[PDB]
């Protein structure tokens, strides 16, 4: 896209090690699924498009940008290695947008929304196996 917008976080490094895990089969299967068909989800399915939203300060501020459609490739694609860093993704990504925006605003009410679920569904992540 435009040369304004940084490149997305890596999806793809040969050299980093990669392994599935029982955690990170239900984050895909159970969290990914269920948060991205959420009504509120469709600010989070890709990088946040500074220069379509006129947000000319985005990444000055937010200097670790993480998105939904991020880790649904890092997870369709075995990037990680463990539930941890696929945790700590959907983390950034709340607290971005949490960092970035005035309390209340409504992509901020819509975040809040899918870290409930979040939340919900990690305290529910299998014992590794
Ligand atoms: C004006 O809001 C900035 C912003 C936009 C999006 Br999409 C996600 C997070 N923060």
């Known amino acids: 896209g435009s040369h304004m917008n940084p490149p997305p976080p890596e999806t793809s490094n040969p050299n980093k090690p990669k392994r599935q895990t029982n955690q990170l089969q239900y984050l895909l299967r159970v969290?990914?699924?269920?948060?991205?068909?959420?009504?509120?989800?469709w600010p989070f399915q890709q990088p946040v498009d500074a220069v379509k939203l006129n947000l000319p300060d985005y990444y000055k501020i937010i200097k670790t940008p993480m998105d939904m459609g991020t880790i649904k490739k890092r997870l369709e694609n075995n990037y990680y290695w463990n539930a941890q860093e696929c945790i700590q993704d959907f983390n950034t990504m709340f607290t971005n947008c949490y960092i970035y925006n005035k309390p209340g605003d409504?992509?901020?009410?819509?975040?809040?929304?899918?870290?409930?679920?979040?939340?919900?569904?990690?305290?529910?992540?299998?014992?590794?196996?």
Request: glycine letters at 0%.
């Open 31 to 41: 969290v990914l699924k269920t948060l991205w068909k959420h009504q509120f989800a």
């Open 106 to 129: 409504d992509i901020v009410l819509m975040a809040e929304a899918l870290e409930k679920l979040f939340l919900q569904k990690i305290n529910e992540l299998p014992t590794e196996e």
